[PDB]
Amino acid sequence: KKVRPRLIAELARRVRALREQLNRPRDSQLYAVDYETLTRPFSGRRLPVRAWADVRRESRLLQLLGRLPLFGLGRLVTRKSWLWQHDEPCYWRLTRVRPDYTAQNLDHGKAWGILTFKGKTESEAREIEHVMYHDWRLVPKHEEEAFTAFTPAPEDSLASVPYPPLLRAMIIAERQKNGDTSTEEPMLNVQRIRMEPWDYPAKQEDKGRAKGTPV
Amino acid sequence: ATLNQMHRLGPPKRPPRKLGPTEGRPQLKGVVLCTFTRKPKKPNSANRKCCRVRLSTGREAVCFIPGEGHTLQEHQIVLVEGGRTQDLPGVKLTVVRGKYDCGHVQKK
Amino acid sequence: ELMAWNQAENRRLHELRIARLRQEEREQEQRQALEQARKAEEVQAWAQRKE
Amino acid sequence: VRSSVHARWIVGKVIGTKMQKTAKVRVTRLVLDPYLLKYFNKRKTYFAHDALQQCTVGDIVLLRALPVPRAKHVKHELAEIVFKVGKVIDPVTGKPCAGTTYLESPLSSE
Amino acid sequence: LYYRRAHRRFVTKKALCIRVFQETQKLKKRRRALKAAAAAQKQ
Amino acid sequence: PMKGRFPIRRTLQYLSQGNVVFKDSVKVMTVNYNTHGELGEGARKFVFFNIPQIQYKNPWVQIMMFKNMTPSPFLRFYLDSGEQVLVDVETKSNKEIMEHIRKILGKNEETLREEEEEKKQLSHPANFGPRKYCLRECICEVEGQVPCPSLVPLPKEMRGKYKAALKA
RNA sequence: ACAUUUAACUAAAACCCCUACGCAUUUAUAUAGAGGAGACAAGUCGUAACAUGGUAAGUGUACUGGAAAGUGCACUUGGACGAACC
RNA sequence: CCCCACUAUGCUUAGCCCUAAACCUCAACAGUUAAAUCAACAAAACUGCUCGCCAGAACACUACGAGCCACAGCUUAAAACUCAAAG
RNA sequence: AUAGGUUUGGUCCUAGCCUUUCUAUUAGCUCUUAGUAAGAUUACACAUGCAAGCAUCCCCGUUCCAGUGAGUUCACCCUCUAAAUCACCACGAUCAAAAGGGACAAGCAUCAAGCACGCAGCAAUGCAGCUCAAAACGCUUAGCCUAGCCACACCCCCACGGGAAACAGCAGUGAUUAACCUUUAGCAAUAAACGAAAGUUUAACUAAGCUAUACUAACCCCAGGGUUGGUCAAUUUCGUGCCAGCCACCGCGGUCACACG
Ligand SMILES: NC(=O)c1ccc[n+]([C@@H]2O[C@H](COP(=O)([O-])OP(=O)(O)OC[C@H]3O[C@@H](n4cnc5c(N)ncnc54)[C@H](O)[C@@H]3O)[C@@H](O)[C@H]2O)c1
Ligand code: FES
Ligand SMILES: [K+]
Numbered sequence A: 001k002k003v004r005p006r007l008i009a010e011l012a013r014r015v016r017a018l019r020e021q022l023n024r025p026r027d028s029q030l031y032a033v034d035y036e037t038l039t040r041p042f043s044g045r046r047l048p049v050r051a052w053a054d055v056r057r058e059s060r061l062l063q064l065l066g067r068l069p070l071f072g073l074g075r076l077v078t079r080k081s082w083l084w085q086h087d088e089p090c091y092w093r094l095t096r097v098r099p100d101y102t103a104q105n106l107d108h109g110k111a112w113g114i115l116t117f118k119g120k121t122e123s124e125a126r127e128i129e130h131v132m133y134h135d136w137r138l139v140p141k142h143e144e145e146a147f148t149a150f151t152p153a154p155e156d157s158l159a160s161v162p163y164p165p166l167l168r169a170m171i172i173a174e175r176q177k178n179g180d181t182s183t184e185e186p187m188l189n190v191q192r193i194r195m196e197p198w199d200y201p202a203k204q205e206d207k208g209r210a211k212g213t214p215v
Numbered sequence B: 001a002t003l004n005q006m007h008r009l010g011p012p013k014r015p016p017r018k019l020g021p022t023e024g025r026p027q028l029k030g031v032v033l034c035t036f037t038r039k040p041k042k043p044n045s046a047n048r049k050c051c052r053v054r055l056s057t058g059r060e061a062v063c064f065i066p067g068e069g070h071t072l073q074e075h076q077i078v079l080v081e082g083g084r085t086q087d088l089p090g091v092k093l094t095v096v097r098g099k100y101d102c103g104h105v106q107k108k
Numbered sequence C: 001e002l003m004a005w006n007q008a009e010n011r012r013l014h015e016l017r018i019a020r021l022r023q024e025e026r027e028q029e030q031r032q033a034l035e036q037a038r039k040a041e042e043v044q045a046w047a048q049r050k051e
Numbered sequence D: 001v002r003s004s005v006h007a008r009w010i011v012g013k014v015i016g017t018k019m020q021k022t023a024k025v026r027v028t029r030l031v032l033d034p035y036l037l038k039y040f041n042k043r044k045t046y047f048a049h050d051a052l053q054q055c056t057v058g059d060i061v062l063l064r065a066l067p068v069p070r071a072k073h074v075k076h077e078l079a080e081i082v083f084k085v086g087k088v089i090d091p092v093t094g095k096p097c098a099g100t101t102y103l104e105s106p107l108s109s110e
Numbered sequence E: 001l002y003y004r005r006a007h008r009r010f011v012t013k014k015a016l017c018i019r020v021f022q023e024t025q026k027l028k029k030r031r032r033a034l035k036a037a038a039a040a041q042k043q
Numbered sequence F: 001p002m003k004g005r006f007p008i009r010r011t012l013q014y015l016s017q018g019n020v021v022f023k024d025s026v027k028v029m030t031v032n033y034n035t036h037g038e039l040g041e042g043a044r045k046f047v048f049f050n051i052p053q054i055q056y057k058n059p060w061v062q063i064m065m066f067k068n069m070t071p072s073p074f075l076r077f078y079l080d081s082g083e084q085v086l087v088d089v090e091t092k093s094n095k096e097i098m099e100h101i102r103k104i105l106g107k108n109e110e111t112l113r114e115e116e117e118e119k120k121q122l123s124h125p126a127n128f129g130p131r132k133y134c135l136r137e138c139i140c141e142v143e144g145q146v147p148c149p150s151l152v153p154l155p156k157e158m159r160g161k162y163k164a165a166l167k168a
Numbered sequence G: 001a002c003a004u005u006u007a008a009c010u011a012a013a014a015c016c017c018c019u020a021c022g023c024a025u026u027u028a029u030a031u032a033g034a035g036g037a038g039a040c041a042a043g044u045c046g047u048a049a050c051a052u053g054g055u056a057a058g059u060g061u062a063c064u065g066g067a068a069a070g071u072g073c074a075c076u077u078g079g080a081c082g083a084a085c086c
Numbered sequence H: 001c002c003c004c005a006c007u008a009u010g011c012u013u014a015g016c017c018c019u020a021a022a023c024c025u026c027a028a029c030a031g032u033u034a035a036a037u038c039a040a041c042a043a044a045a046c047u048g049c050u051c052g053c054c055a056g057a058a059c060a061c062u063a064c065g066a067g068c069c070a071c072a073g074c075u076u077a078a079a080a081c082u083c084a085a086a087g
Numbered sequence I: 001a002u003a004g005g006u007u008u009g010g011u012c013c014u015a016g017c018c019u020u021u022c023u024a025u026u027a028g029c030u031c032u033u034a035g036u037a038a039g040a041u042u043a044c045a046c047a048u049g050c051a052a053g054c055a056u057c058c059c060c061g062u063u064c065c066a067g068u069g070a071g072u073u074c075a076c077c078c079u080c081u082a083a084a085u086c087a088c089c090a091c092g093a094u095c096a097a098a099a100g101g102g103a104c105a106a107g108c109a110u111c112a113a114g115c116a117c118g119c120a121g122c123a124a125u126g127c128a129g130c131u132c133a134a135a136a137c138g139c140u141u142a143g144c145c146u147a148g149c150c151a152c153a154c155c156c157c158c159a160c161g162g163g164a165a166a167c168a169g170c171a172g173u174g175a176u177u178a179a180c181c182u183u184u185a186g187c188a189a190u191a192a193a194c195g196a197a198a199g200u201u202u203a204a205c206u207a208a209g210c211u212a213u214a215c216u217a218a219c220c221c222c223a224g225g226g227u228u229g230g231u232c233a234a235u236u237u238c239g240u241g242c243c244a245g246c247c248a249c250c251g252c253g254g255u256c257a258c259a260c261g
């Protein structure tokens, strides 16, 4: 039952984990793109055809913040995909920015901020995702007040929906079997279920990162 | 034996089954080395046509060639099967007629 | 409840044990008295022989 | 209360007391022979922590499983000495007995 | 516990095995002071 | 013939006739009995006949036996809580001893029936699968459903070989 | 064997060691040569055994002899001693 | 094989060797003579319990390994080929 | 087993061997159709094509499925508690690692001793113990306990590093073995991956091709193979002359062979 130790399996494991931390690729290498073939030279993978247009016309977040005093702290940044989709003001209020110093133009890095999606401001600041996307736009200072003007519409929404055919019949049968005599209709309380949009910013802290294998 | 003795000894240990000349295989291929005859044991008398072949496993064995008349020669390939020749002591292999170089016996 | 009943049963059996042991001693004492009487005679007769 | 040791309560015979504060106990269980369908004793050795070193070779002991093994082989502790070797007290009457004879008659204390 | 003859080969091998253990125990202690000395030097 | 006196004891039928199924509290059972004396006859019969039946129904309970250690036979059970149940068996027959421990430490017939009913639910008649686990292997066995192709060939219209031939 | 640094108006950067294996150690296969065992219709020498087998047979052990075998010592009956007297 | 002569040896002392048809070929303990007693022969047939041992003949009181004051030894002890018998 | 043949001049007992039953591979000879199931001998070497993508960039996936059986008590139960799913902080549940306890193949004892295999103490350190004929320690063999599971993924147990250049993914080829399936189609069904999704991808899989290996149902035409002394169902006449040959066992053939052709 005494298992024979495998030392090389543990040695290489530590060496691999270490090298993944010392030779890790930077955002400048990972998220570079050849604008003629529209492929990431790091991996040589083609971008999706639906992204080709914006990659050529739109700017990344730190292609904008690299031109500002403190990388645009306390400045509002929106996204074209948000402007086209939602009428309500959607933006990040930048709070922290870790620029990638290896970029020749300081056009890569990370960013933190406070999200305000569709006029609902989040209570706490969290890391911004899609910072490497060609989608961001900087809000001029003189346009900030008008841009952020929002009136909350009435939240009147459906509170209860009927059970499907079979489930309803099975709940009414249990009532009669137990003896309870009532004519009320069983209904599902969907007020607790808050359906958020599919393009709502996800948690960047839980998102992974590309591995080092370069092409 | 007593119940205590039977428990301490356990079930009978099946004697290992012995592999015959074919090593538990239906047939073996071989190369003819020499062809000769052997005289059977009592009370029989004949000149039974046998040959020595080198089996694919590397062992060389004497194999009886059945039928009336054979054309086997050295450096020929034959298929051998089990089955002892009851007359010839120690000949436990038989050449298959109609396979590789060994042809079917000619009618009458 | 079952454990209490078991202890009660053991107590009842113990009372029967004491009664049985008391009777056995009475018989033991009687047998002992007879053995001692026989032994005393043997020793006396044997002591006289050596004297 | 939860313990990771498989055997929670086991009675055994003390077979060795040469380790410090550790009594070596032989525990026997009845195992069915599948062919003969007769029960034969199967014995296993258990190390039991004895803090007071009050265990003697040949005495019957009760071992309680420790919450976690204190040593590589010590997974139990001496819970109680059921029968002391040569100094047995009859549980039924509570009187000292040598074999099948009472050293003190149960009728002494009524 | 056991009733088995202690022949020469066993008796001789058991003597060495005890000697080897005694020689190894002493080495375990000579790798204790050397480690202690180095630790004291760091301070 | 089968070896030993009373060979019936070494039969699965006899071993399964024990009615004493200890509760989960019982962990150890020490049987102290004397080899001679008329007052210990029942304890000797109980060790000869009934210990095999008790162990068969309680495989994980340790039963240990001690000979001629005390003037009288007795049983002692060690429960998981730490309680010790001493049962004096002097003068009692092997049948009385067996009935006694069933009452004080044996599961009642209701408790056993319930456990057996829970096992019944493990095998679901409607489930299909190998015969080791289920009654039927495929729906094709149920009459009215399309039989298995191995027994009754399917129509050419329902076979993929000709489905694509009619289309092309 | 091997080092705690740089940095700190948001915060991060830096971190990467060498030692084995040899014609040694293990287990087999092949054999100059030397021997056994078994098998095998009609070879040679003697006749040891089976009848009291022509010295009853055999066991252990020792010595001796072309070969079976011979002899000593003890032991066995898996030999016999003819079963009233003469 | 028969006759004669004479050694080792048979004896004593002190150490080895550890074998036998060491077999009354019938294991130790307890109990039975009832019934089908019971293949044959031998020294009638059995019960309880326990340890030891045996599973066709030959190879084989052998080979190898291990132990032993044994070194031409003893103890433990196979396999391959062979036969349809051996007993 | 409902047993049978065979020791001998003969009888009884014991005993081995073989016969009769049912399956799987391979060989000879022979072979019409349909449906279904199953399908390299080899952990030996492999030409060529394909088998992992998805998607407004990030991520996620390629850690699965599929394959093989080299090695081999890592698989089961309990305790404890990661990761993962339940949108999300919960919640507890579900699922399930590492760690701890217990359990778990075969043959050989001509493998009988292993040689540090234990305990106490906060530590320092002290004690000398621990396993083993109820089989330790070893050698040999083998995937297993099959709704499936375990192990492996060219070799060096591992894989930083070396040898070196990898089909034990599908189809296919060489060598090798008694052992011999197509270098088809499609993502329509189900399953998996990805997407918010319409959808996209998949040699998983589905539907076909090949093969008496098996089962099932047919066939107006079209039947072969083995056997015929006894066990054991069934031989006429010739040739051969202990020759040629036959036999599972006992045996047959020496000039009248129901045993060979
Ligand atoms: N081998 C032991 O030292 C030993 C220890 C305890 C119990 N036993 C018991 O001894 C019997 C024989 O066991 P085995 O078949 O393994 O031995 P065995 O006959 O194969 O001999 C193996 C070893 O055990 C010894 N031995 C043999 N019989 C013995 C006995 N009765 N008592 C003690 N030692 C004995 C021998 O001297 C030898 O050294 C069994 O009942 C066993 O339980 C033996
Ligand atoms: S097994 Fe059910 S259709 Fe074939
Ligand atoms: K003849």
Ligand SMILES: [K+]
Residues within 6 Å of the ligand: B043, B044, B045, I242
């Ligand atoms: K003949």
Ligand SMILES: [K+]
Residues within 6 Å of the ligand: none
């Ligand atoms: K003679």
Ligand SMILES: [K+]
Residues within 6 Å of the ligand: G056, G057
């Ligand atoms: K004679």
Ligand SMILES: [K+]
Residues within 6 Å of the ligand: none
């Ligand atoms: K003897």
Ligand SMILES: [K+]
Residues within 6 Å of the ligand: G076, H021, H023
């Ligand atoms: K005798």
Ligand SMILES: [K+]
Residues within 6 Å of the ligand: none
């Ligand atoms: K027979």
Ligand SMILES: [K+]
Residues within 6 Å of the ligand: none
């Ligand atoms: K065929």
Ligand SMILES: [K+]
Residues within 6 Å of the ligand: I069, I143
């Ligand atoms: K395997």
Ligand SMILES: [K+]
Residues within 6 Å of the ligand: I157
């Ligand atoms: K490997």
Ligand SMILES: [K+]
Residues within 6 Å of the ligand: I187
């Ligand atoms: K599909």
Ligand SMILES: [Mg+2]
Residues within 6 Å of the ligand: B083, B084
């Ligand atoms: Mg034949």
Ligand SMILES: [Mg+2]
Residues within 6 Å of the ligand: G033
């Ligand atoms: Mg030679």
Ligand SMILES: [Mg+2]
Residues within 6 Å of the ligand: G047, G053
């Ligand atoms: Mg003579």
Ligand SMILES: [Mg+2]
Residues within 6 Å of the ligand: G053
């Ligand atoms: Mg004579």
Ligand SMILES: [Mg+2]
Residues within 6 Å of the ligand: none
């Ligand atoms: Mg003589």
Ligand SMILES: [Mg+2]
Residues within 6 Å of the ligand: G064, G070, G071
């Ligand atoms: Mg002479």
